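Page 47, continued from p. 46.
Same chain as before, 606 aa.
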Amino acid sequence: MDAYSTRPLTLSHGSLEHVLLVPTASFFIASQLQEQFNKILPEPTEGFAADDEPTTPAELVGKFLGYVSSLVEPSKVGQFDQVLNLCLTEFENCYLEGNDIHALAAKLLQENDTTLVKTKELIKNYITARIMAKRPQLVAIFGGQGNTDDYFEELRDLYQTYHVLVGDLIKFSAETLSELIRTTLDAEKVFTQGLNILEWLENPSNTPDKDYLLSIPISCPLIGVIQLAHYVVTAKLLGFTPGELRSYLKGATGHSQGLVTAVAIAETDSWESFFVSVRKAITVLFFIGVRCYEAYPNTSLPPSILEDSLENNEGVPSPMLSISNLTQEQVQDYVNKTNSHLPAGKQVEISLVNGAKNLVVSGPPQSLYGLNLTLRKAKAPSGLDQSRIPFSERKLKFSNRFLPVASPFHSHLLVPASDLINKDLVKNNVSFNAKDIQIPVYDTFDGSDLRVLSGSISERIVDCIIRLPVKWETTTQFKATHILDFGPGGASGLGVLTHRNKDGTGVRVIVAGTLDINPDDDYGFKQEIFDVTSNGLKKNPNWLEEYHPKLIKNKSXXXXXXXXXXXXXXXXXXXXXXXXXXXXXXXXXXXXXXXXXXXXXXXXXX
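Result:
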């Protein structure tokens, strides 16, 4: 038959072995849902309604037959089992020819209309119907506590897009976190919304409110599942085990809420050493959030503070505030004045030095709001001063919107949860952290190899989160060519903010999403291809320093140009060219042939 509706493509007439089963296909995608989709095709042509490109209905039929299919592996009768295979195999050498159809997402971003939200289904209509009852240098960086204001819906846009690669691990894990609530007693009263996360995925109706999805021991453990499930995605996409992913690594160093996710994943060989090492990751972040929340509880803020936080567009004043693009220890004076008027119980300290400019500060939120008060002083409303002597008298610029962390990590006041949680991690049998880490993971501060046990390493894991300053620049210090990210949420989580720090080097690609913004950090399809290694600028080694010989060996002649306008005017600049220079000559009053016949009054003496 044919892939109809104005862009025809063949779907094999089987000569009475498959011509008889297509009447159970031909009207079947001729539903009114595909037939009210086709009067929109003449005048507002193909803005919607796939058939926008002739692959898009053949995968929509490849959706539809495979989704009203047998739907079970003890297969409902072979009608809805075998013609799926031919409706796969026909496509299998029609538009990919090997090369793993995430490359066809690059083909969708180069040939037809620029759709991504449509592209996500034709991933899913392939890969889910791929499993319907037939047919089975690198530095990793882990995110966590990013600038990602939902932190959960990307898992919702993981389970929705992917059902093959993630449906296994959730059945263990989503039970397992609910299998931990009764263990530590009175953590239930810390967890007053219940941990059946499955129905949060099953419906957006009783998916809970996002701020209480933003409460810390809801945010911190599931984010690690996203930085675990995507690692199974590429293992399932590249046909690999995690050891075959751990074989192809040289970095594997991530942020605070993903460093310990990178810790257990380095000593992970099999799929069978996987889920036993997932419990290294569940029982930390579950216990991490429950210990610090008891140390500093959330309080309802005085709403007198809540007004002026809106006019400066700082958002909710949640106790984590970063600054933008000032040099350090200027603002420490403003810390020094505020910590002077503060008593000892609520003094304020700077957590992070992430990047050369941005500095994260954590502490009590009133005093964090109190820091804004003197930082609303010395701050311009962004008026232009590059006209009159910018680099001598400037009033500077800021951007200090808040961060939605509901427990002030990397601080000093939250000491007793540190020594308490490692008792809790002693309590269950998982605190080995032996030498079995293969890839040299670097620290979130001063990246030692960390196979220097007699550290009892599942004790360092927590003061690295709640005690320690990070200084993220010296965390990297790599020798790579490209960099993995597993940023939990968008093209925003700790990949773009790392990108300023490195130059002359990698064009790093992340796994989450399929967007692009510029040919700087493009992603979506570099994980699943061949014969296209984009290594961009080497602005150091490449473009550096060289003089140069002639055809018969000279020196070029010596790069230092010269061209003024009140000295150079005549044949007394001719001698300036006589030694070794790049002489220019203009602005000689009149241009009425005088200084023009005079050009050859120094061109013959040149």
